[PDB]
Write a protein that binds this ligand. Structure first.
Ligand SMILES: C=C(Oc1cccc(C(=O)O)c1)C(=O)O
Ligand SMILES: C=C(Oc1cccc(C(=O)O)c1)C(=O)O
Lengths: 278, 280
């Protein structure tokens, strides 16, 4: 039977979806599209065999997952789709209410780490669906990912004079490091039961990622007919995202794990098992 | 501006078309929904979809509210392989017998009833149930199946358990000498009039995807053979036996079928099939 594969419905993986379709890879998958927190729960509990895992959930389940090398959802500098929208400066958020988008697990933890250990504020956090308008009427700041964040950063922010802090840029300023928000991984039991299929799926993901980068202009032009963003914005977003996952990216994962591990539920020296090649 | 909500039959008959939609990138212009043909018909008719496949009987019941796509359909000229009657006794011995009808079907089940009533002259006790040959064959004397269940019964379960499998396309061909159309592609009338361009663009993309799927049918069969119960040769045979044309000879078959079942199925015998007009 076809491997059950997850796919983030956000725009960040729309070019990858293009690559999976153009190559015919989709027809080897039983694909499930959803938000990253749902896809992580599904893979961890066994409703999926392979799929994207938000980094915090992967590190909490590192013993049961095998990450795919050379592909991830990340950035080196700004990421555009992970932001803090605030009505006041970040240093004035201590004791204030900050809304956390329900879809996120890694970016919200990154935002909490930055606000606590870089800016030194301790706000009262709460979780709610990602809706800027609603969040801005009930809290002083909001952490968003996905299309909601890109909409807040490129449209709603400038239109209503709200500060939009790029979480990738804040992490780059703080540490000089890139960041990895999500990785691709297979369940350990599936990887050991089907080593061949796991490798073929991994190789197909790399091939689809490679083609999407070569055809990024075609992806942006097509998506521009249906999204709120124009072709230039989408092409910039697709090219600003960093889909590599090598030594410099793993270094960023290691440092992030060290800083949040003791207060998030996984060891500071947690090990990331990578899928070995034949 | 939002992507058109497009249906797609999950059966193997439209797997090559899905390959074509993916390879061309057309999928990324769609909000695609995969399901069985009876659900996809309900969804489009009630407004949950904008464009999609409609089993012919349901299309004719709603012909005033739908606009059929020319030059693409799910049909056959002779055997169709995926629409069959599986019977433990000869067809002429089914009078008063139990015949199970697969819930997934609307057109083939009506075709089977038409053939059994007006060609073979039997009047069995029909009942509808989920498509499960094992269950049907232990509980009824015959069963009408479509989709992967029918193809499995025709190519695998049938010969394995010594059961007669009558191809519904072939029976219709023997009876009338005509091809048959089981499902058509159509847009909601309100959507076609609100978005004529998108409707035409979707129609043209379906034709392009259909054309490419026929050119690369070998690659489709080879890939699908890794995951399905059927081998590559069987899949390639099925994909090439299916007839995806929808022109004058196919509409002629629809007209004749509508005339024979219309008075007893819920649409006029003289029902009109509105085709999407091309730009001048
Ligand atoms: C690039 C992004 O960063 C992500 C992606 C997936 C999950 C998360 C998370 O916060 O769990 C963040 C984006 O949202 O587009
Ligand atoms: C070729 C087939 O014929 C069909 C297709 C779709 C719907 C129906 C129906 O009976 O409603 C029949 C197949 O099932 O593969």
């Amino acid at each position: 039977t076809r491997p059950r594969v997850g796919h983030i419905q956000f725009l960040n993986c729309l070019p990858l979806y293009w690559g999976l379709a153009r190559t015919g890879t989709l027809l080897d998958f039983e694909l499930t599209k959803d938000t990253p927190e749902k896809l992580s729960e599904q893979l961890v509990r066994g409703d999926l065999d392979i799929g994207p895992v938000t980094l915090v959930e992967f590190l909490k389940n590192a013993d049961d997952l095998v990450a795919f090398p050379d592909i991830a959802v990340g950035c080196d500098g700004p990421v555009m789709s992970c932001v803090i929208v605030s009505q006041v400066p970040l240093d004035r958020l201590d004791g204030a209410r900050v809304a956390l988008g329900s879809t996120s697990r890694t970016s919200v933890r990154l935002a909490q780490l930055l606000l606590s250990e870089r800016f030194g504020v301790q706000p009262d956090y709460y979780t709610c669906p990602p809706d800027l308008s609603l969040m801005m009427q009930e809290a002083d700041a909001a952490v968003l990912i996905g299309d909601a964040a890109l909409r807040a950063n490129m449209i709603d922010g400038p239109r209503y004079g709200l500060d939009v802090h790029d979480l990738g840029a804040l992490w780059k300023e703080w540490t000089g490091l890139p960041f990895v928000f999500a990785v691709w991984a297979a369940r350990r039991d599936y990887a050991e039961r089907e080593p061949v299929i796991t490798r073929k799926v991994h190789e197909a993901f790399l091939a689809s990622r490679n083609l999407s980068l070569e055809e990024v202009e075609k992806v942006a032009e097509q998506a521009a007919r249906w999204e709120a963003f124009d072709e230039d914005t989408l092409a910039k977003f697709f090219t600003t995202l960093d889909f590599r996952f090598g030594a410099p990216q793993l270094e960023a994962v290691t440092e992030f794990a060290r800083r949040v591990g003791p207060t998030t539920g996984f060891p500071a020296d947690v090990k990331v098992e990578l899928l070995k090649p034949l």
